[PDB]
Amino acid sequence: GAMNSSNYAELFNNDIKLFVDDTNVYRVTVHKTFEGNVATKAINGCIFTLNPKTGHLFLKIIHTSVWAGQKRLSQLAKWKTAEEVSALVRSLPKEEQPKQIIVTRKAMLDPLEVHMLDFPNIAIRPTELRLPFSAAMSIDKLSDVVMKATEPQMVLFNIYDDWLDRISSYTAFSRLTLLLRALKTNEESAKMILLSDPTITIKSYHLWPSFTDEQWITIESQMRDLILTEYGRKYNV
Amino acid sequence: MNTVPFTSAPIEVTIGIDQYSFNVKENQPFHGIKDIPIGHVHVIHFQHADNSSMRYGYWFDCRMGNFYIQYDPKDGLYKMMEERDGAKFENIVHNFKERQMMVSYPKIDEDDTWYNLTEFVQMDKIRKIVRKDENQFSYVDSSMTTVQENELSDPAHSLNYTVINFKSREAIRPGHEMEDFLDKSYYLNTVMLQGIFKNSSNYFGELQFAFLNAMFFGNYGSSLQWHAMIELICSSATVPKHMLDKLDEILYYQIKTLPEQYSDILLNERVWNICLYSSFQKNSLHNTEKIMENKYPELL
Numbered sequence: 304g305a306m307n308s309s310n311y312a313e314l315f316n317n318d319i320k321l322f323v324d325d326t327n328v329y330r331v332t333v334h335k336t337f338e339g340n341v342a343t344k345a346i347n348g349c350i351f352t353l354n355p356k357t358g359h360l361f362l363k364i365i366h367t368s369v370w371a372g373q374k375r376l377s378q379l380a381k382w383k384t385a386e387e388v389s390a391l392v393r394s395l396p397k398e399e400q401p402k403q404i405i406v407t408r409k410a411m412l413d414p415l416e417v418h419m420l421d422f423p424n425i426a427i428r429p430t431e432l433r434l435p436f437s438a439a440m441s442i443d444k445l446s447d448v449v450m451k452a453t454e455p456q457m458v459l460f461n462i463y464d465d466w467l468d469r470i471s472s473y474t475a476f477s478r479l480t481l482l483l484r485a486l487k488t489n490e491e492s493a494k495m496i497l498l499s500d501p502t503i504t505i506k507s508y509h510l511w512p513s514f515t516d517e518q519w520i521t522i523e524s525q526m527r528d529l530i531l532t533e534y535g536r537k538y539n540v
Numbered sequence: 541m542n543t544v545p546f547t548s549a550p551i552e553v554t555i556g557i558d559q560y561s562f563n564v565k566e567n568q569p570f571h572g573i574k575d576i577p578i579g580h581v582h583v584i585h586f587q588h589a590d591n592s593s594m595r596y597g598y599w600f601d602c603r604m605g606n607f608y609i610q611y612d613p614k615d616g617l618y619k620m621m622e623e624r625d626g627a628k629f630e631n632i633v634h635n636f637k638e639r640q641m642m643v644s645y646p647k648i649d650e651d652d653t654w655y656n657l658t659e660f661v662q663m664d665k666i667r668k669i670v671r672k673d674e675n676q677f678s679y680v681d682s683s684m685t686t687v688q689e690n691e692l693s694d695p696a697h698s699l700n701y702t703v704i705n706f707k708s709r710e711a712i713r714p715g716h717e718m719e720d721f722l723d724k725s726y727y728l729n730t731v732m733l734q735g736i737f738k739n740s741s742n743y744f745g746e747l748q749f750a751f752l753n754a755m756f757f758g759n760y761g762s763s764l765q766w767h768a769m770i771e772l773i774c775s776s777a778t779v780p781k782h783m784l785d786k787l788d789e790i791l792y793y794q795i796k797t798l799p800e801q802y803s804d805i806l807l808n809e810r811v812w813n814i815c816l817y818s819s820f821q822k823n824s825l826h827n828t829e830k831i832m833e834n835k836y837p838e839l840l
């Protein structure tokens with residue numbers, strides 16, 4: 304059924320699973336028109352499809368041309384996400400196909416269920432976790448590939464860099480969610496924390512800086528302080 | 541006019557005949573029902589006074605044979621049987637008719653209610669939903685499950701309604717997932733009408749039969765089928781205009797006949813609010829919308 308804090312270790316077992324987040328599929332800017340009405344302009348988006356055990360991220364870039372001449376774009380975006388996830392599953396060898404797909408928003412359940420009717424043994428599930436995957440576009444190398452795309456494209460990343468050499472997937476996912484939550488809450492301060500020290504830099508083939516074990520502890524503490532600092536700013540605590 | 545005689549009435553029972561009902565006392569001199577209108581299917585149904593468990597009954601058409609009811613003390617119910625000796629049957633009916641031991645089917649001449657509820661219902665189609673080929677009449681009860689209910693358990697005692705499942709490969713063409721899920725016209729017109737039912741009269745007959753089994757027996761699977769068949773039409777953008785007009789008439793008479801005190805268990809709020817106020821056909825069921833708003837505004 305739904306995925307919550309009681310079955311959280313299930314994310315790191317040996318049953319292949321993918322999270323699907325559709326927040327960033329249909330993105331727009333809102334602006335006034337010459338006549339004083341309001342218009343939207345779409346910008347490139349992306350589907351965030353992540354294996355939480357391995358860190359493999361299938362980033363399908365959604366080019367603005369897919370919306371051309373279409374109506375009800377917010378609805379279409381869910382069905383387009385489901386179509387693309389279905390296509391991804393069919394493209395994977397059988398032994399790589401997920402046994403479960405967990406959608407971050409309940410509105411993705413029916414579109415994905417309908418697109419996956421041919422896969423009755425893949426469970427489509429919601430989650431009670433509030434996961435900050437919308438902040439994926441705060442990761443500079445991900446945002447750059449999305450905004451530069453001139454056509455639909457799929458790009459593969461490992462969102463954990465090389466962390467699994469040193470830590471478990473439970474800890475790596477916890478680190479990711481903390482980083483993404485901080486980037487979502489105060490992007491400028493999070494990037495400052497992540498980039499202030501110039502002696503520690505991101506490898507060409509990585510998304511995050513090359514922190515030692517001790518430095519990750521320091522960074523994680525600074526991210527938790529940021530989140531708490533912003534909570535206090537928000538609620539006047 | 542035709543007659544369903546009773547050998548006797550050994551146990552106290554509420555007897556239904558179509559939309560009518562009456563009580564018979566234990567061992568009362570009751571010998572059946574006369575003046576049954578020829579030209580329609582009928583249902584004769586039972587609820588025992590000492591055990592309201594299992595409503596049960598029989599669908600029949602007096603044009604197909606001479607049927608009578610006799611209580612079986614071993615299986616503990618009133619059973620319909622067919623009398624093959626026509627002369628014996630005529631003689632027994634005449635005797636009971638002369639002794640005034642039959643109730644008269646109490647049809648008001650102005651009243652088209654039963655025709656309006658059974659316009660599309662045919663015995664031959666009933667006998668394919670309810671499979672007991674050795675009898676010309678069909679037994680239904682409160683507890684019988686549907687083929688679809690059994691897939692989600694004795695198959696011989698099941699209601700074989702046409703399975704409707706909005707999230708099934710039958711309902712959704714590969715490549716048309718969004719289209720077919722948000723607009724059920726393919727599933728209604730190609731799969732169901734052209735493919736399975738052949739015409740709208742057969743679809744409406746099954747819809748009407750499901751409603752009647754829900755109302756007269758409290759059969760839960762029948763109520764599910766009734767609502768599914770309504771939702772399938774209302775959720776289709778493309779429906780022949782004659783079908784929408786006829787559906788409005790069908791549903792109006794069903795809502796009109798429904799016992800007010802059973803509305804909470806016979807009407808699905810989600811389906812009705814969706815069909816009347818959100819669906820493609822939300823403006824195509826004027827008569828049904830008006831009776832629903834005036835009789836059951838709480839459901840909405």
Ligand SMILES: COC(=O)Cn1nnnc1C1CCCC1
Binds near residue numbers: 547610628629
């Ligand atoms: C052979 O069984 C019977 O004869 C039963 N019976 N007894 N009295 N009436 C009947 C029914 C038989 C046909 C009409 C009513």
